[PDB]
Amino acid sequence: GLAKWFGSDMLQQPLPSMPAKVISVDELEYRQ
């Protein structure tokens, strides 16, 4: 899916961990 934009070698090597998902109570209550 992401291969459309990123090289094959990049999808393979170790990547930095995603930043912590920080959500606001507004979005949490508004969506679900």
Site for its own copies (CB under 8 A): how many residues?
5
Distance CA 13, CA 23 (A): 29
Decide: is 31 part of the binding site for another protein (CB under 8 A). no
Please pick, from the candidates 1, 7, 16, 19, the single residue that binds its own copies as defined by CB under 8 A: 19
Cβ-based neighbours of 2, under 8 Å, separated by 6 or more: 11
Q: Quick one: what does residue 14 bind among another protein, its own copies, none, with the CB cut-off 5 to 8 Å set by partner type?
A: none
The phi, psi pair for 5, rounded to 5°, reads: -120, -20
| 4 vs 9, beta carbon nearer its own copies | 4
